[PDB]
Structure formats: structure tokens, C-alpha cells
Design a protein around this nucleic acid. Structure first.
Ligand code: K
Ligand code: K
Ligand code: K
Ligand code: K
Ligand code: MG
Ligand code: MG
Ligand code: MG
Ligand code: MG
Ligand code: MG
Ligand code: MG
Ligand code: MG
Ligand code: MG
Ligand code: MG
Ligand code: MG
Ligand code: MG
Ligand code: MG
Ligand code: MG
Ligand code: MG
Ligand code: MG
Ligand code: MG
Lengths: 200, 142, 154, 117, 69, 420
RNA sequence: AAUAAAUAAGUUUAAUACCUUUUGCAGCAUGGACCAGCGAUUAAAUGCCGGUAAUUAGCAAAGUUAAACUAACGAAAAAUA
RNA sequence: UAAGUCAGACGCAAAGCUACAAGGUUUCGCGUCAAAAGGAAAAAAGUCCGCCAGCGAGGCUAAGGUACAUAAA
RNA sequence: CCUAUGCAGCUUUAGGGCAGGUUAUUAUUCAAUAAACUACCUUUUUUCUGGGACGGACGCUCUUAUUAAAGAAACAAGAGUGAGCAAUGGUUUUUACUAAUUAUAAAAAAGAAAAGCUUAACUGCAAUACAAACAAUUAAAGCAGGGGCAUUGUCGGCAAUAAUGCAUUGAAGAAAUA
RNA sequence: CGUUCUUCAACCAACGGAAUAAAGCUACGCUAGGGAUAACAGGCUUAUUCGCUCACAGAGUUUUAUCGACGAGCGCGGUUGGCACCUC
């Protein structure tokens, strides 16, 4: 046992059992545990159902030409791309890369959590049904270079790996769900002319 | 000043119910603490070895003079104590060698293959050389 | 190859036995000789000599001679002249009715046997055959080879 | 190893010989990039600390506590995060107070799609 | 021979088949009287001198000795 | 041991003396001494660059020996894969083989139930028959014997091939051994177009003075073939073969005795030898009688007309033997293991055709199975019901009716399982 | 260690160079004042082990060199006649 | 892999030597460092939690914390 | 100060040599050989180690602590040994006996002593294992030959655990070649 | 003259034994290396050293005025030591 050579005892014992089994047949031929073994199942408990969520974003049309925007007196909170935003018309937000949309398109955001004005507030638990936010896709860009560098002193270890994140830009157009307080109504045209191209 | 003697590994090598083949060493001891039972032998230094194919057993006996005796036994495969078991053991020995060669592979050679033949003495193979090397069967009488 | 100072490789004994000189012969199996005849590369209706074996491709390069060995089951006679032979080959050929002859050649004689044209093209007489072999080789040869072999029918 | 062009691009705002001397600038460039990896990690810890301080200050002006608010939101199933709550307390005091009143007193009027079932 | 030592010998080109080499002078009919040499006894002593000996039997090369003058 | 590392078996003196020699041929010995399919594959893989046609011929022949060792089961996966690889070398060297080498190649591949591709098989046949068989003269008796049986097993039925082969071999028939002639006779019987040719008559005449040299297995096959080939016994072989069987009735193995006995019964030459025939069967029934031979014994005894006797209930034991083979039950007794009883080889699925034939024969025996608590035919049908239950997919309308007729004949028609 | 991450631009927080050598170095252990140029497993023969091909190789030009191969136990019977 | 390595260190737990001393020395069981960034204890190789592919102003926790410094009763 | 594939100079009754002089022996009309004295040339003068030197030690067994598997180190501790026996080996019979070893709870179908006969303290081989870096070291069923005591069992030295030394070189007996 | 078998011997006790054999001085010294290793200083340890407390035996002889002990515990880093952690 003092030696560090690996032991061959398991090999010597297996050769002995294999020789006996090959030449001498067994007496038993059945095993009850195998006979009554049941069908394989996925689990022993009912599955847990999932909680529904409103749609994240969906295209509804395109923008025809140059437009202008004016300031309004309402705001809301919307969940998008894994993070929450507080938005009001004519705001610009930056998010992760959104797939399946193009520049100069109008999208509809439905995961609205809070709506507010100067006279009333509406709180979702956790989402408000029947509210939405409209926005225009303005950019798909690569952000500034981030230089990633690693080194370990006195260990001859060095790594350099620059990268460029992918992001998307949106401009908020309209917030629907809550009326402005009395005297705060915007009584003039505000937004662009939208060509509707999404009928379900 | 220092120094130590080389270690001797005294002790048992197998337990109850373990399978053994002829010639395998079961116990290494300095004194006859354990005595040979059935289907076992004993060397001149009290080494106990198996003489058949079977499983190891341990038992205790109380003697006439009040002493305790300990035996080592080897039990046949199916508790067969008839004199016909010897031929079955001989076949098992041949089979075991075949099993080992299959597992090891062809490149673990078990026989030599030289560019010459080994001499024959008394009808068996000998490792000692003759005074002169000659080709077999390449000469005629006279 | 240095092992640190133990020098374990030189702790083994030395053997001085001299191997037999017959390890310098070219070995030809009886089973390979038959295959050539069956394919048609050798003429079995006449005496086969080492010159025919060399040209047929059975033997690659000869410096001393050819040793014939092995067992084979034959159905037709064969007459072959070689320099050495074992007992298994002799029994196999004679069982079918053949004849195996061990012929003694010298260095100059072997050249004439294999490449006779090398002498005729230069208008040189062929080498002469030997008179006899040393008595120490009694039991090794049956006849003295003739530089132009005498072919017969089989 | 960075080239001369890369080294001097990184070190254009360094002081003294660190700007135009290769040996001096190279060691200054590598040490700075090491600071940046640590800096990005710590930024996420500091900003969350600032959000909590602002929320706590707003809560205590009304007689409440930050820890009481976080527990109360989870009982109402309100999933606003700390970045949004921090901004409400600073820029939308009236909406921030409305959230506190709902959690503490639960006196909000429920809204249904069919106003008259 | 142990596997580790055997591979080194093969890697260096060891391919001997017999304990000694055959003698061409023993082949019948190929005896050359001019090239006659009495059989000698093989030497079994390795050359262990660390200055002009076998490089495989010494750890490093030692300087040579001075000539008598 | 002392020479090798732990766990490495010590050298065998018989093998060591073969490999240690002054003569060449190392690769041939290595493949000839291989003990398993995997070992032979490793030898060929490590020697690919030096393989030659002689090596390929021996490798295919070795497949016959490895199969024999692994009896009691069908061809295993490693054997099949090894055979496939060897075929590629046969195609490569198809134009370099000799007559003897081709003979060995076909025999080995035929013993493994491997069908050579028609294109390759045609090439091999062309080599043998090329030059009108003038090269067939330079072949020994064994080469000719393997040519006839090897191609016949493959199924090559080219008339020109057999015509040329028969013409060249014809003059040498009188000088072949009894076993070689018997193999030729078997091929002639299987080939219809040679039934009435002069070659068939020449073979029978040549075998007349060599009857005494036939082995028990070849002797049994020769008697079978001669009965179909020459029912008129014009050559006299049947008379001589029958005389030898009568003289040496008890000197042959059980299998050969059963085959000869069945042939005599179908020839309507039955004599009061049933008492002598019954005792060997009961003496050795658990062995030397597989399913096929068990059916042969039943047909011969039933045709001869032997009736069950109190001292020796031959039909009763045969039913137990049939049930044992169908079920495949094994025994761990030392005597059974050392005796190499056929029943301990394992389980081998049998064709439904044999099951129907056995059931019909038992029904024709005239013994009951159901009514009595312990009847001679009870164990067989009880085993039959269990076996059929696991293979219902193979039962069709005709098979069910055939068994139903047998079940009614024996006396089991109530729709209930056998008592045993 | 003279920078980094942020910012309402007022400031706030994080943060003891590199190499070599070590059980362990911000090291009060070793080397470099800075810039440009020069500066370190290369070639031949032979052997071993993988990969990719040719399907023996070189001369010569119907004939020669080099290599490789060359007996191991002739063991299968699958005929519903 | 016919490669590198044959200078090791400390914590908890045992024994020999020392003085039931040493950040001592010799063996032995587990872990960590060596070759391991991040969080807690003041700085913190070897203790406690825990193993860094990259970016983000999302969320839940471990060891440890919850009048100021300093996030949270 | 210690460590080197160390270097150099000097010293001597450390090893080897003769190549100048002296001396000895022999030979030819300034020569040849050398276990001497002087001069000169060349070579050697371990390691471990609580730094090195000084002292001590280096092979192989038994026992103690690190528990009741094995294994496990220090210039840790306590004791042996570099053999003996022609019977103190092998084997049968008897019984008022059951010890001793350097040390030790071995052993009753076993030993010791007494009485008788003997040389297996053999020739040629050997499955399988213990251990082990390797070299070697340890146990051993079984087969053939010639023997011993019994009359169908045992004997390939000794209760067991120490009494040892590779290769090379040299020597002896026999046999085969040349 | 050479080979094989049966065997033994010498120095290898520095006992895995080989370059056949085989001692010293250097403060006149020289080169390559190490804080992997000593001498001075720092560090860790506190046996020893030193101090205090308990102990109140014994001397003084009414007084624990003064002197002072066996034995135990704790502290100090200034005495003699141990280790080899920093610098060749
Ligand atoms: K400068
Ligand atoms: K010290
Ligand atoms: K030594
Ligand atoms: K110093
Ligand atoms: Mg000693
Ligand atoms: Mg250090
Ligand atoms: Mg400097
Ligand atoms: Mg070392
Ligand atoms: Mg070490
Ligand atoms: Mg330490
Ligand atoms: Mg290191
Ligand atoms: Mg939390
Ligand atoms: Mg606070
Ligand atoms: Mg030293
Ligand atoms: Mg070994
Ligand atoms: Mg006897
Ligand atoms: Mg003995
Ligand atoms: Mg110096
Ligand atoms: Mg130090
Ligand atoms: Mg230390």
C-alpha cells in the first residue's frame, strides 16, 4: 500500500466474476423491481402556470415626412427592454437593440405601470390595462468604444478586447390613458401623419 | 542515529464472500494466528493461499484445552463438495486468462517472438542457451 | 539517456553466443513457390534453379544462397535446386513425387549461374565449377553445382 | 503590446513626459485602463445608493420610512423600481405622495373596463 | 525492459536482433584467405571516463588532462 | 507472475514456440492465432501497409473458426463489421488471387451467411473458370472440395460455370477421397440441371469402392443424396450404404443415426430394429438432438410405427425435450455444464414452421395432451402456448387454423391453457 | 504611480509603477535618465511519433539495385426429401 | 505528456523533538494560498462569505450590518 | 561566511612515471636497463549536518508514540545482528514432558526429548499472487525423472520475523565447435 | 583460439558497488553565485533573568517596626539563550 502505483485489484476481481458468469449460468431469471417498473414521468407534481404579461412593443405604421412636436402636461412609466422609463411627449430614450423594427416606424408600448397628471394619478398593479405609449424609431447605432483590459503583475498575463455595444433610439410621441387636468388641454395638432400598415 | 527497517504489510487481503482463484494470497502473518481450513494451504512463513475457485470464509473454533482457534476456508461456487468440482475449476482457470487478454488488448503481448527458437531440455522449454546455435532441420545424417 | 548516476542499464550480464551463418541466406517458402507456379510466373515442366527464381521475382537479391522451408500440399511433381532446405519442405515435395537437390556454389560460380550474359557479352569464358566442398560441411550439400545447369523434363 | 499610435492616442491629455514619451506613457496607459474596469463595476453600486437616500428623505417628510415602503409595495403587487421612485420624489411630489397613501391606507378607487357592469 | 527505458532505446535507433553479429567467413564457399582474423572475445567493460567516454553514462563533459612535458 | 506486470497472463509454451523461430511469416501467424474478432481487426489495422492476397484469404477463413467458437447465437456485430471491411480488400485484389485463395475466400464468407455482391462474385467465378479450367489442374483435393461447396452455398447457378468445372474435375473423381466425393455428390443433388448428366453417374460410380472410407457425417449425407439421385439403386450405392449402417448401427453418433434411420423409413425398408433404435434416443436425449434433429427423430419413429411402451416412453421424454428447447431454461448443475448439453447454450428463437411441423407430428402420434393430468404431450403444448403468446404478430389465419387442427386432434379444444 | 468612474462643473467617490526573483515584494531585494537604429532554438545528416498524398521506390530502357511479403490445426453442412 | 514539477506557506485538529515555547522543527487529516479578482473584519497572501467571457443608472440574496462618519429599524 | 563540473600557487614518508645528475650492474672501442637518493612531470584528497568545523553516522531485523485496516518522518526512543548446526536437516514409533530464543499471549493431532532407518541441505520446469519507480527481493498449487521414511502420506533445508553485495575482471569442473 | 552449462574468489562496510590507485596549507590569494546559510543590528519566543501579588513558615519576641521562605500565579522585554523571518 505504501507504493504510489495505482492498484489493479478492481481489474483482477472483474476478470474473475466475468469468467464465472460466462461459464456458469445463474439460477434466478427475474427481478421484481424490474418487472413492475412503471413508465417514466416528467415529475410528481402538477406544473406551475405562468403569469401573462402585456405585449412589449409592436409596429403600427410608418412616418411620411418631417413633423413637429409640442409639450404636453401628462407623463407615464413604461417597461421596455428590461428597464423602466419615465416618459413624456418629445422625450428621447436609449435602449438595448430592438429587433424587427426600422427607422421612421411607429411602435406601440403596452406595459404601462403608472400614469399621472396635475390633478390625478393612476397606479397599476402591476400594469394598467387599456393604456399605451407611442414612439418613433430614430436610430440603430453602435455606441462609443469601451476598452477592456486585464493584467496580472509579474505573471506574464495581458489581455486586450475592445468592444462596441448595440443600442436603439426612440422619440416619444403620445401618451394615452389619462386626461389632462382642466385648462391643460393641447388644442392644436401635435404629431406626424402616420400611414397605418398594421391591421389585425 | 536514525534508520528504519523495510515495512512488512501484515494483514488480511479478502473478506467474507469475496471470490478467489488458485494461488491467491489471503493472509500475510508473522505467526500462526490463523490456521488453514478447507481448500487452502500454508507456506513455510505462515502465508495462507487458496487452492480452488470459491469464496472466502472465516470461522472460530474452541479446542479441547480451552484455546480459541481461527480458520480460513474457501467454499465452492454452488456448495459443491463432490470430487467432480476439480475439473470445473480447471476450465474456469483457462477461461479467466482468455477474459483478461480480451480486456487488455492485442498490443499487450503475453508471449515472446524472437528471431530464434529457444532450446528444448527434458521435453520442456528452457531459457538457457546451447554452446552452438543451429537452424532446426537443416542438416542430414552423416 | 542519463539516469542520474544509478546507471541501471549496465547492471545486466553479457551474452557472446554467435548466431548461425544461415541467417545470411534468403528465405523462400514452399507455399510462395507454388503460388508463382499457379499464376504462371514459373515453369513447372522443367527443372527450377535459382536463376529462374531471381528472374521470376521470388527472390529479391542473392549474395550467398536460397533457403527453402515450410509445409505445402502438392498434387504435381517439382524439381528444384537450392542451396539449403529444411525437412518439412523436402517431405512436401517428395510426397508429390518431386526431387530437392542441395547444390554447392562458390562466390565466382554463383555469379555465372545468375548472370551468364554478363560474361558472353564480353566474350569471356564462364566461371568453372568447384571440385569438392570441405568435409566440415558434409551433410549440407548433395551435389556440386554446374555453372550452366542441366535442365530436364518433369 | 500597444503601438506608438495607440499609446499616444490614449495619452493625449496626460501631464509632462507622460504625453509624448513612449516608456513613460505606456505604463500610464495600462494603469488607467485597469482603473476603468473597476470604475464601471463601482458605478452600479453608487447609483443605487443615491436612489435609496432620495427615497428615504421623501418618505420621512411625510412620517414614513424607506423599509416600510419597500415592504408595502410588495404587498400591493406594485413593481416600480428604485430609479423610477427616486425620480418621482424629486420631480413629481404629488404622484409620489399618492403612492404612499395607497400603500399605507389603501383608499384608492378601483378602475374596471366596464364602468357599469 | 521497462517501458520508459525501452522507448528511449527505440527512439535512438536500437534494432539489434541477435546477441552478436554473424560472421560472413563461415558461409560455405565464401571464405576469403586474405580477410582472416582470429576470433576475439567481446569486451564487457563500459567506457565510463567522463572526459572521452560515452555521453549517455556521464552527467556532463569534463576537461581533458594535461599532456606530459 | 515474474516476467510481466501485474495482471498480464503468463506465456503459453505452445504459442511461444510458434512465434519464436528463425523463419519468416510473422504476420500470418499473428492472424492465425487470433482468438477474437476484435483482436484480428487490430492486427489488420496495424499491418495495413503490408497486407497481401494471402493475408486476406486467411483472414476470411478465420471468420469460420471464430463463428464456431461463438455457437448458440447468431452472427455478432463485430463479426459482421469485420466481414464488411474484408470485402473491400477482396475487390482490390480480385484480379490477383489464385484458385486456392479464391476457394478459401468463398468458404469463409459463406459460413457466416454473407452474400457476396453479384459483380464481385462474377469476377471470382471468372478467375476459376478462365482458360477453360486448365489452371484447375494445379490444385489439390481440398481446393476442389471447397470450390464446389463454397459456390453452391453462395447460390451461383451459372450453367457455363458449372459445366466447365465439372468437365475439368471429371477425370480426377476416381482419385479423390471419400469425403471429397461426398461433397461433390451433395452439390450435384442440389443442382437440378446436373441430375441426369453423365457427371452425376460418374460421381456415383467413383464412390462405389470408397464407401468404407466415408466419415459418419459424410456417410449420412451421401445416403440421403443417393436416395433422391438414384431411387432405382442401379449403382448399388444404396445397398452398400444400408449394409454398412446395419453392421455399424451403434458405432455412429446420435445425429448420424437419426438421419440414416429417417431415410430408411421413407424408403419403406423398415425392419424390426425399433427396439435397438429406441434405446440410444432415450440414453442421449438431453444432448446431441437440437430442434431440427428432434423433428427428424419423431418423423422416423412415427413413420416406422413404433408405439409407446411402459418401460421406455420415448414420446413422453421427447415432449419434455421439445419444451425445454422452446423455453430455453438452463441448469447450473456441474454435470450439465461439463457435459456441454445443448439446452444450456441459451435461448434461440425458432421458426414458426418448425413449431407447426412438431405440433402436427405429435398430433399424428396418437397420444393425448389435455385430458390426463400427466400426459406425454402435456409439456410441449404448454411451452408452445407460452412461446406463441409473445409472438402473436407472426400468427396469421392459416397458422391459427393449422394449430387448431393439431390441438383438436390431441384433444385440447375447450379454449383453456394446458395443465402444465 | 498624477489617473479612473461620474457631475447641477462648485465637487464627490475608487485607487501603494513595471520587470526579474520568491513560501511570501508598494518594497527599505534586483535592472532601467530619455529617443532612434541594431540585438537571441538557426542549418545539415540520421532516428522516433502524428498529419496529407502516391499505390512499391531508384536507375536504366524486355534488366537490374533497395525495400516488403513468404504454413498456421484444411475446423463450414444452413437439403419443409 | 520521452512535457513541466522534485526550495513550499499558514489556519483548525492530533503526536514526536524543544520548555505540553517560537511566524521553530519532523510526520499526519481537511481546507485555503501558491496559480484567485470581488464582499465583511482598519491596512489584511494562508481567517469568514464566494470563483471574474463582455456591456447596462433593472431585481433577489450570502458573510456581515440597520442613531453620525456610512447604505438600511 | 557558506555553496561549485571550480582555478591557481606552495608542502609532504598521499598514488603513478623516468625524462637531467649521482649511484649500481652489464656491453662496445658520447651506450643500454633501474622498487635507490636528489631534480622534474602528471593525478587524487566523499556526502549527510537546525551555517561550517570538531564529534557521530551510512547494510539488514525486532519493539515504542502518531489507537483498535495498511502506510507514515526527525542527529526521536529501547534492544539485536555480518551466525550456527553432518544434526539442531528428512521421515516413522513410543509418553508420569509442554520449554526456550535479542525480543514476543506462535503451536495439542502440534511440539520437545528418547529409539530406528536415511541425505529432498535433489535434476529439468511451473499456473497464480504479495510487494514494488526500476533493478532485484517474497509465497507457491501442479508436471516429469531419480530417491528417503512410511505403506499411500510427507520431504525442493532449519517455528516464524536479521546472518548480506549488481555488472565487470579472474579462476576451476564438464561438454560442443573450430 | 572461441562459445555454453555447473560453480567460486578479490576490492566494493561511503554496503545501487566503477576515471585502476591515491593526503594537506593559503592571513599572498583569484573567479562564478546565495540573505536558499553564519558573524553586528531589527523581528518572533520568554526557558532563564527581573518585578509584583498570594502564601506569614521561620528569625525579631506581643506586633507584618524590620528581615524573610517552601510553593503557585501573572507581568516586563534591559541578562544568558533558541529560531533563521528582512538585508551578501
Ligand atoms: K525625456
Ligand atoms: K540555527
Ligand atoms: K556511496
Ligand atoms: K549582507
Ligand atoms: Mg548501527
Ligand atoms: Mg527569502
Ligand atoms: Mg540603477
Ligand atoms: Mg532535490
Ligand atoms: Mg524537497
Ligand atoms: Mg514554519
Ligand atoms: Mg512559484
Ligand atoms: Mg432586499
Ligand atoms: Mg443613512
Ligand atoms: Mg557538506
Ligand atoms: Mg519489477
Ligand atoms: Mg512417495
Ligand atoms: Mg521443510
Ligand atoms: Mg567575489
Ligand atoms: Mg532567511
Ligand atoms: Mg524553515
Amino acid at each position: 500500500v505504501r507504493t504510489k502505483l495505482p492498484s489493479k485489484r478492481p481489474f483482477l476481481q472483474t476478470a474473475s466474476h466475468l469468467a464465472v458468469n460466462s461459464l456458469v449460468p445463474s439460477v434466478r431469471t427475474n427481478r421484481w423491481a424490474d418487472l413492475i417498473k412503471g413508465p417514466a414521468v416528467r415529475s410528481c407534481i402538477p406544473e406551475i402556470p405562468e403569469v401573462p404579461k402585456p405585449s412589449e412593443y409592436t409596429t403600427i405604421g410608418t412616418i411620411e415626412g418631417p413633423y413637429t412636436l409640442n409639450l404636453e402636461r401628462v407623463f407615464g412609466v413604461v417597461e421596455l427592454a428590461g428597464s423602466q422609463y419615465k416618459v413624456t411627449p418629445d422625450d428621447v430614450i436609449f435602449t438595448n437593440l430592438l429587433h424587427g423594427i426600422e427607422v421612421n416606424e411607429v411602435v406601440m408600448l403596452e406595459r404601462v405601470m403608472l400614469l399621472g397628471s396635475r390633478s390625478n394619478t393612476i397606479i397599476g398593479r402591476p400594469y394598467i390595462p387599456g393604456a399605451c405609449v407611442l414612439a418613433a424609431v430614430e436610430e440603430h447605432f453602435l455606441d462609443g468604444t469601451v476598452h477592456v483590459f486585464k493584467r496580472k503583475k509579474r505573471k506574464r498575463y495581458r489581455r486586450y478586447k475592445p468592444t462596441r455595444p448595440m443600442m436603439t433610439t426612440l422619440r416619444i410621441l403620445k401618451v394615452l390613458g389619462i386626461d389632462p387636468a382642466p385648462g391643460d388641454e393641447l388644442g392644436i395638432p401635435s404629431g406626424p401623419v402616420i400611414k397605418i400598415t398594421n391591421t389585425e | 542515529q536514525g534508520g528504519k527497517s523495510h515495512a512488512k504489510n501484515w494483514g488480511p487481503k479478502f473478506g467474507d464472500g469475496e471470490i478467489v482463484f488458485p494461488g491467491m494470497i489471503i493472509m500475510r502473518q508473522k505467526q500462526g494466528i490463523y490456521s488453514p481450513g478447507y481448500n487452502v494451504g500454508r507456506g513455510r512463513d505462515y502465508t495462507i493461499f487458496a487452492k480452488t475457485v470459491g469464496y472466502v470464509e472465516y470461522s472460530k473454533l474452541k479446542t479441547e484445552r480451552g484455546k480459541t482457534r481461527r480458520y480460513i476456508h474457501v467454499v465452492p461456487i454452488n456448495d459443491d463438495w463432490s470430487p467432480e468440482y476439480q475439473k470445473l475449476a480447471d476450465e474456469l482457470v483457462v477461461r479467466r486468462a482468455e477474459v483478461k487478454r480480451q480486456i487488455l488488448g492485442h498490443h499487450v503481448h503475453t508471449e515472446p517472438a524472437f528471431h530464434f527458437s529457444l532450446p528444448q531440455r527434458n521435453g520442456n522449454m528452457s531459457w538457457l542457451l546451447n554452446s552452438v546455435h543451429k537452424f532446426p532441420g537443416t542438416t542430414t545424417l552423416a | 539517456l542519463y539516469d542520474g548516476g544509478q546507471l541501471g542499464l549496465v547492471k545486466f550480464p553479457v551474452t557472446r553466443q554467435i548466431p548461425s551463418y544461415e541467417v545470411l541466406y534468403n528465405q523462400l517458402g514452399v507455399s510462395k513457390l507454388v503460388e508463382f507456379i499457379q499464376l504462371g510466373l514459373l515453369d513447372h515442366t522443367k527443372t527450377i534453379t535459382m536463376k529462374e527464381l531471381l528472374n521470376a521475382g521470388c527472390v529479391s537479391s542473392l549474395k550467398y544462397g536460397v533457403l527453402l522451408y515450410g509445409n505445402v500440399s502438392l498434387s504435381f511433381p517439382i524439381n528444384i535446386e537450392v542451396t539449403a532446405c529444411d525437412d518439412r519442405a523436402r517431405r512436401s515435395i517428395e510426397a508429390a513425387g518431386g526431387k530437392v537437390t542441395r547444390v554447392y556454389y562458390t562466390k565466382d560460380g554463383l555469379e555465372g549461374l545468375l548472370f551468364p550474359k554478363r560474361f558472353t557479352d564480353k566474350n569471356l569464358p564462364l566461371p568453372r565449377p568447384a571440385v569438392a566442398w570441405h568435409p566440415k560441411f558434409d551433410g549440407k550439400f548433395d551435389a556440386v553445382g554446374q555453372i550452366p545447369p542441366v535442365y530436364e523434363a518433369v | 503590446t500597444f503601438s506608438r499610435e495607440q499609446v499616444f492616442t490614449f495619452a493625449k491629455n496626460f501631464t509632462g513626459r507622460a504625453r509624448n514619451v513612449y516608456k513613460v506613457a505606456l505604463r500610464r496607459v495600462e494603469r488607467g485602463l485597469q482603473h476603468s474596469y473597476v470604475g464601471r463595476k463601482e458605478k452600479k453600486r453608487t447609483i443605487r445608493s443615491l436612489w435609496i437616500q432620495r427615497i428615504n428623505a421623501g418618505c420621512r417628510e411625510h412620517g414614513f420610512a424607506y423599509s416600510a415602503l419597500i415592504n408595502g409595495l410588495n404587498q400591493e403587487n406594485i413593481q416600480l423600481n428604485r430609479k423610477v421612485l427616486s425620480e418621482l420624489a424629486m420631480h413629481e411630489p404629488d404622484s409620489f405622495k399618492a403612492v404612499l397613501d395607497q400603500v399605507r391606507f389603501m383608499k384608492g378607487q378601483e378602475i374596471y373596463a366596464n364602468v357599469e357592469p | 525492459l521497462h517501458k520508459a527505458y525501452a522507448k528511449k532505446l527505440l527512439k535512438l535507433g536500437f534494432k539489434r536482433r541477435f546477441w552478436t553479429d554473424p560472421d560472413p567467413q563461415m558461409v560455405p564457399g565464401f571464405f576469403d584467405p586474405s580477410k582472416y582474423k582470429p576470433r576475439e572475445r567481446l569486451n564487457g567493460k563500459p567506457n565510463l571516463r567522463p572526459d572521452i567516454g560515452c555521453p549517455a553514462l556521464r552527467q556532463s563533459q569534463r576537461p581533458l588532462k594535461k599532456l606530459p612535458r | 507472475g515474474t516476467i510481466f506486470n501485474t495482471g498480464v497472463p503468463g506465456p503459453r509454451p505452445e504459442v511461444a514456440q510458434k512465434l519464436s523461430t528463425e523463419y519468416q511469416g510473422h504476420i500470418l501467424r499473428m492472424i492465425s492465432l487470433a482468438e477474437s474478432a476484435s483482436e484480428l481487426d487490430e492486427v489488420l489495422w496495424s499491418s495495413k501497409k503490408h497486407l497481401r492476397p494471402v493475408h486476406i484469404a486467411r483472414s476470411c477463413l478465420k471468420l469460420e473458426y471464430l463463428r464456431t467458437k461463438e455457437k448458440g447465437r447468431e452472427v455478432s456485430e463485430p463479426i459482421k463489421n469485420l466481414a464488411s471491411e474484408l470485402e473491400n480488400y477482396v475487390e482490390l485484389y480480385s484480379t490477383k488471387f489464385t484458385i486456392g485463395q479464391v476457394s478459401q475466400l468463398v468458404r469463409g464468407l459463406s459460413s457466416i451467411r454473407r452474400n457476396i455482391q453479384p459483380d464481385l462474385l462474377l469476377k471470382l467465378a471468372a478467375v476459376v473458370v478462365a482458360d477453360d479450367g486448365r489452371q484447375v489442374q494445379l490444385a489439390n483435393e481440398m481446393d476442389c472440395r471447397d470450390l464446389f461447396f463454397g459456390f453452391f452455398s453462395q447460390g451461383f447457378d451459372n450453367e457455363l460455370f458449372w459445366k466447365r468445372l465439372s468437365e475439368s474435375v471429371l477425370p480426377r473423381l476416381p482419385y479423390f477421397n471419400a469425403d471429397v466425393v461426398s461433397t461433390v455428390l451433395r452439390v450435384v443433388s442440389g443442382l437440378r440441371f446436373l441430375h441426369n448428366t453423365e457427371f452425376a453417374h460418374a460421381t456415383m460410380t467413383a464412390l462405389v469402392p470408397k464407401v468404407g472410407d466415408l466419415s459418419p457425417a459424410r456417410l449420412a449425407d451421401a445416403f440421403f443424396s443417393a436416395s433422391l439421385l438414384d431411387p432405382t439403386d442401379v449403382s448399388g450405392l444404396n445397398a452398400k450404404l444400408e449394409e454398412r449402417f446395419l453392421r455399424e448401427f451403434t458405432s455412429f453418433p446420435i445425429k448420424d443415426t437419426v438421419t440414416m434411420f429417417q431415410t430408411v423409413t421413407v424408403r419403406r425398408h423398415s425392419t424390426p430394429e425399433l427396439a435397438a433404435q429406441v434405446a440410444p434416443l432415450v440414453a442421449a436425449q438431453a444432448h446431441q438432438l437440437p430442434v431440427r434433429h428432434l423433428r427428424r427423430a419423431l418423423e422416423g419413429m412415427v413413420t416406422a410405427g413404433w408405439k409407446d411402451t411402459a418401460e421406455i416412453p420415448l414420446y413422453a421424454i421427447l415432449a419434455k425435450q421439445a419444451a425445454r428447447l422452446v423455453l430455453g431454461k438452463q441448469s447450473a448443475a456441474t454435470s450439465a455444464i461439463l457435459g456441454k448439453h445443448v439446452d444450456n447454450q441459451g435461448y434461440q428463437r425458432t421458426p414458426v414452421q418448425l413449431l407447426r411441423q412438431l405440433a402436427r407430428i405429435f398430433a399424428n402420434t396418437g397420444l393425448k395432451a389435455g385430458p390426463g393430468a400427466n400426459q406425454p404431450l402435456a409439456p410441449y403444448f404448454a411451452a408452445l402456448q407460452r412461446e406463441l403468446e409473445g409472438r402473436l404478430a407472426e400468427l396469421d389465419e392459416q397458422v391459427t387454423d393449422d394449430f387448431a387442427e393439431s390441438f383438436k386432434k390431441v384433444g385440447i379444444a375447450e379454449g383453456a391453457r394446458v395443465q402444465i
